[PDB]
Amino acid sequence: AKTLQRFENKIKAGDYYEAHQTLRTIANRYVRSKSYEHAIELISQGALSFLKAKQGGSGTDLIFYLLEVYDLAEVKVDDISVARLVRLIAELDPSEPNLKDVITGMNNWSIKFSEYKFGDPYLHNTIGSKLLEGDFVYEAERYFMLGTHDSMIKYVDLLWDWLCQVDDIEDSTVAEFFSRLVFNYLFISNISFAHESKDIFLERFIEKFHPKYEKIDKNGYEIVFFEDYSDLNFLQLLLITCQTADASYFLNLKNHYLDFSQAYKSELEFLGQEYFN
Amino acid sequence: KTLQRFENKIKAGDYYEAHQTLRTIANRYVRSKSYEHAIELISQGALSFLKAKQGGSGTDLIFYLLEVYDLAEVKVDDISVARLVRLIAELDPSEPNLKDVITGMNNWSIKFSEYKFGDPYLHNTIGSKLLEGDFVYEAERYFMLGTHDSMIKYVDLLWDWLCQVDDIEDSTVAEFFSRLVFNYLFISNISFAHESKDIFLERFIEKFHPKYEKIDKNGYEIVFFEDYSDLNFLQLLLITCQTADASYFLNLKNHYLDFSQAYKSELEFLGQEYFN
Amino acid sequence: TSASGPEHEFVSKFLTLATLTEPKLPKSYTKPLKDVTNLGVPLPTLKYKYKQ
Amino acid sequence: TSASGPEHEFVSKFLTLATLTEPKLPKSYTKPLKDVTNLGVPLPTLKYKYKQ
Amino acid sequence: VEPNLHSLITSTTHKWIFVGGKGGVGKTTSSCSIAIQMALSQPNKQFLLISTVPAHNLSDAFGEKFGKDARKVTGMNNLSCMEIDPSAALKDMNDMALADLTGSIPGIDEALSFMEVMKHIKRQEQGEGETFDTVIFDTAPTGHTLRFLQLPNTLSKLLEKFVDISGKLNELKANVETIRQQFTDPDLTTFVCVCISEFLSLYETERLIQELISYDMDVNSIIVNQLLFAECKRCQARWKMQKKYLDQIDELYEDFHVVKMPLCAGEIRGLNNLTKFSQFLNKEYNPITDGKVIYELED
Amino acid sequence: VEPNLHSLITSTTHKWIFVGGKGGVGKTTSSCSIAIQMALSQPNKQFLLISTVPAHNLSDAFGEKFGKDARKVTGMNNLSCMEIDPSAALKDMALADLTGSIPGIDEALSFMEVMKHIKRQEQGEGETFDTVIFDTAPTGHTLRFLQLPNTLSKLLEKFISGKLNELKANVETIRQQFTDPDLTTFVCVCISEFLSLYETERLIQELISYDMDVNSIIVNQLLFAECKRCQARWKMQKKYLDQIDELYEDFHVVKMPLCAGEIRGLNNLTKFSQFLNKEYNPITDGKVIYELED
Ligand SMILES: Nc1ncnc2c1ncn2[C@@H]1O[C@H](COP(=O)(O)OP(=O)(O)OP(=O)(O)O)[C@@H](O)[C@H]1O
Ligand SMILES: Nc1ncnc2c1ncn2[C@@H]1O[C@H](COP(=O)(O)OP(=O)(O)OP(=O)(O)O)[C@@H](O)[C@H]1O
Ligand SMILES: [Mg+2]
Ligand SMILES: [Mg+2]
Ligand SMILES: [Zn+2]
Fold first, then answer.
1. CA distance F62 to F32
2. Are the beta carbons of F198 and B24 separated by less than 8 Å?
């Protein structure tokens, strides 16, 4: 209680070490009395501040401590629950040596107290952006993968901005980026995202590289046929083919693109397991 | 300017002080590899602590000596065993770690000698010590692998035990006698087997006065007891092992069926040692 | 041009065939993330470095 | 007496037989303790307590 | 909260009393005190002061030499010590390239120390009785000590996930599960931490204690040793720092048995001087009444 | 024998410098000093202060929070710390959990981190630190950790094949560089008290038998009186102090005074560490003792 004053004092005084623990000791006291709500607020708040003061250590510690309480008080995953953690994620230094740790800590909690096997979507969007701040592209790609619509937007931009950065682009180069969107979203069975991500990416590819093409439409579906990117064509046809779940179409598409069936061996194999039983 | 220092503390009543001070100074000799100096310092210091009835400190130094012994690779000889023997005499038979000390040196006696079980001379001293602590069985073994004196104390150990018996029996006497015969026959010490058997049988006869008659032939004598079939069997077994003749062994066992079952394990080994 | 005619006739025909009857999975379909069990097969690593 | 005659005739005869020719191991024999490999078979524990 | 350890010192239910904390504080000295104070306060009871610390200091504290076999403390009638040495502890049980290499492996200290604890449990079951009513421990710093206190649980969670070989398994689970329920019983086992008046000690204490309660261990004591209690320039200056951490101590541990202790004018050794300083753990130190005993331990 | 640790502090060959001794003495404080004194004396070199002690105190000494990932000490340009925590160390890399709660896990892991720096120099990745000061635990458990190289070897011997070769080599290197008086030395932390002094003599004797370099002995918490207690306690310290000069005459004995408070923060730590470079002198530095208060 009255001690609270004396420590925040040490904070706004230049004694980070002092304040961090003093708070923790007082915090552990709240938990001891099972006054969880009080603890959650104390710890969480104190962390954010340490992060704002650029005190990576102390801050990261409290963040975990909060999670520890979260799992102790069995805090269910909801808006207010995710909010606190999200708020903290924004103050985390993308260079924090234990970034991935923090990310995992909360995501784990999001899973244990939710019906999502991979964590809460909303929380993912925030986490994804953070990982990218640390140039952890691959790690980010996955979180956005299982995120919200915004995650999709950042995901397509993540790949696109990467494709452009390429100095020695190639016919197969474009496929390396595009295929990811199609496959990844086809793995989590998110046809809506697969189509929208594919739409934004293909349009940007066309308005920048100006590849000679002609749109082929039929029954409502459209395939942006590229005269110099056979890979892109195959990948687009694969998307629609998975929607039909028809074994014949799957076999026909692969028999025509023998090399692409070998270049996307593993992927096509799983697709036959998910959309063809 | 140091040896006095602690001994001044020892007299002033500071055993703790002197013991370690000595050890620290001792380890210094070892550090300079001046083994001989260490051996003397430690050894002497121990004896004194033992004479002062300081079981702890004393026992510690004794081991420390052995530690150096094994470090300087001190070979097992008269002077080497002597020091340890001298110390064994000052050891309190009640020392909680008696067996430890005993094993410590005996182990050393083995590592630096051709004896697989340790130096005989050292055994005689160790054996007596164990007995002081009433560790009869443990003593029996060391005397077993000791000197002539060990044999004398061994027979006395068993004999004095047999007499202490209040409810003696026909098979009772066998429990003691058989040990001598078997034990010495195991280490192939016919000389000891005969002499130990002689002193024991004579004492058994001059105290219990069992009706008997000595049977002689070709130089060998079997004190036939009219009421101790076990003793007879045991005596015959001794000589039989000397012949190493399979037939005799079979004949002796076939006549004493029950004794062949009572001494099953033993006879089995005897057929492995004296009959291949 | 007519250099990529063979593949064009395939893509165009395959599409027509794959959409005669409404596919089993509509474009506005999205398996709730509460049901996703696995993340499919790991894709290969891009030979390009990232930054921003 | 003649109560233990049967065994006496055995012990006496066995001795005579086992000593016609000098036994392979003389009474003055003693395997140097430097050669003893094992201590034979463990004997049973006496049912008497020791002290002195 | 009574500023003394009387409740415990006189307790008749307790059987295991640990003494831990950061190093250098005096876990051996304080334990030496707790030992003497209980053997004197509880006549008809036999006590044992065993040190699981690889670097035994009980022999140094009391003075006399302790080994692998229990040895009554000179001067006491019902108080023995031990101090298990891994090396010698493996040569005795073995003589009775693996055995040697076993006493040189990190953690061997704990493992064996626990085996000795198992030895006292197996005895009460064997009908042989008990050789000691209570046991004071001279543990090592906070860290490694907690590892030893986790041995019961670990040895259990491991033993579980497992021809007389079936009998052993039974005499193994039991002996362990007992030590487990024994330590989780606030009346049979408690924890006494040894700290000083300095941040790095105080804070490490708060941490150590929190862990203990999560282990379901009884913590009903806190000794604040090496206090100056000034009123030269350094002593008055250092006392200033001590009073700073002292007041904070009264806060964090208000519902705890806080027993302050002064800094002698020398080292406290030998049952003689040890008992003279231990009396303050029974009856809180008072400058007004005991302001001269502080200098009595010198020389 | 120079009463300072200059020879080492300025040494350019050493890479591993252990700091052990009984507890409470100040193995973390003294190490904090040795660390600052080397990073300042050796500019073009990067130093690491890792604590293998389960109960980490480096964070307490300096003040700032250290974790599983190396963190440069605030104020220094070439000095980082670590402090390996078994639990978190096993979660990052029903068995795993139970592994970070087993006695000895501290040593094992601490050694794995040592293996990590060895595997790196071989991997061609280079070295991240020139010298490493250790904040070991009391004498006992510490010796156990120092025996890990030999034990891990004598065990590894009595035994993807290329992986075991990489391990065998890495560890062996440690064995070779640890027995080298120029690459690794030992600095003991003791006070002016029997139970400390005597435990020191013992600890040191073991070290030499381990073939470990012991070229330093710090005598901390000395009063150097000239109240009644300080003068009385100084009397005892001088008693053990004179004996110290005897047992360690051919050793680098560096005495150290008792401050009027706790020594923390790179600021006050460096102020007290200067005495390990240039022996304390009551005539010239008789006022610095009270400068660390507050
Ligand atoms: N109450 C006290 N007053 C004054 N000095 C003390 C006190 N307690 C301990 N000491 C000092 O500390 C020494 C005893 O340390 P011990 O208490 O032996 O350390 P330790 O507990 O064994 O360290 P560790 O716990 O890591 O093994 C003595 O030499 C003495 O000078
Ligand atoms: N020169 C000194 N004079 C007085 N007190 C000191 C000095 N150096 C360190 N200390 C005290 O010791 C503390 C540091 O203890 P550390 O040195 O952290 O103990 P420790 O070595 O970790 O104990 P352990 O070895 O059992 O883990 C500081 O809080 C300080 O108060
Ligand atoms: Mg201690
Ligand atoms: Mg330390
Ligand atoms: Zn003073």
1. 8
2. yes
